[PDB]
Ligand SMILES: Nc1nc2c(ncn2[C@@H]2O[C@H](COP(=O)(O)OP(=O)(O)O)[C@@H](O)[C@H]2O)c(=O)[nH]1
Ligand SMILES: [K+]
């Protein structure tokens with residue numbers, strides 16, 4: 001074994017250097033076990049920990065006439081040309097600027113009443129305002145304006161009375177109070193989850209926003225996209241339409257065409273055995289990899305609503321079960337790094353549900369956000385299923401027919417499936433929960449029509 005000696009190897013070709021590591025590699029790998037201070041038997045500190053010295057530098061600034069000069073200047077023509085060219089370039093989401101760090105990206109009347117007339121002048125013990133500021137031209141125009149305003153106001157009260165006066169006004173009239181919103185519908189909005197989301201975004205060079213094919217606009221998070229455009233514009237955002245196997249092919253094609261106007265969009269079907277769109281996604285990520293040639297590698301973040309298949313997409317890319325997947329929301333709790341290649345990293349993130357007042361509890365329940373078992377009255381959301389699914393699809397799925405409304409549908413399904421309580425009365429809550437779970441998990445086919 002003379003030829004395997006380190007002296008012989010050095011003839012053929014720091015501390016710890018061998019065949020598998022050179023000095024640079026050894027010095028880099030020693031970082032993970034560094035940062036510890038040195039103590040002796042006497043207690044004296046031979047050396048302090050790295051970045052932990054207690055010495056006091058003499059903080060000084062030397063005088064120089066160059067501190068006061070102009071640091072950056074540009075001509076008018078060059079500034080105008082730069083504005084035009086790069087401002088036109090930015091708006092395209094299919095365009096990417098190379099070496100964006102070294103670019104000069106930072107280069108990119110009603111009168112006030114108060115100044116002439118103060119609050120004291122307008123009203124109070126010391127007021128001096130005695131006549132209207134802008135008096136009417138004459139009496140007839142004033143009466144015409146009053147008549148027009150009264151007509152408009154009466155119309156407005158009639159319009160908003162059909163929602164408020166018949167609603168909230170009568171609600172408190174009888175003393176009735178609507179039941180408080182269930183805490184289940186507020187899930188996905190804890191500060192832990194949003195800290196995870198912001199960490200993932202801050203660490204991601206490219207962010208993949210995952211949308212469900214059946215309901216892409218419903219699962220799309222406008223607030224996060226607006227925040228990324230305003231605050232981290234150098235990151236790239238793309239659309240991946242997951243679960244395209246549930247909808248018809250033409251629906252997916254139309255949705256991809258509609259969404260590609262905003263930003264690059266790929267239709268995807270996440271599966272370990274037989275998938276769709278894996279090669280296209282790999283090609284796009286590779287393209288982004290060559291575009292960021294300066295960086296050691298690029299990191300890719302997956303964000304979206306819960307149960308959109310982010311972990312499933314990562315598993316499809318790895319062709320392995322490297323990420324936990326489950327239909328129940330809240331499966332992924334923290335971010336997770338996956339090494340797709342040496343140049344590309346993937347980050348798994350918990351699903352986020354941006355808070356919106358206009359999103360009713362029924363819509364959130366129908367987007368797969370919440371756990372169905374925790375809903376109080378699952379039957380009350382059953383009619384919604386009836387207005388999102390074709391009758392023939394339900395007849396094929398459950399092998400039943402002849403219902404007039406949701407109550408009869410639930411009763412017939414429960415009797416057919418034998419979901420009977422003690423005494424023979426059907427289990428309405430359990431069957432309703434099963435129907436909601438089946439709607440969410442894709443057993444019942446449904447989709448939203450794409451815009452014309
Ligand atoms: N039919 C279908 N189901 C999917 C697809 N992707 C994910 N799922 C299902 O959605 C459930 C939850 O998805 P998951 O990967 O955990 O989404 P995540 O929470 O965002 O990571 C799983 O039980 C999957 O079986 C898909 O492309 N097609
Ligand atoms: K999940």
Ligand SMILES: [Mg+2]
Nearest residue numbers: 310311324332
């Ligand atoms: Mg997941």
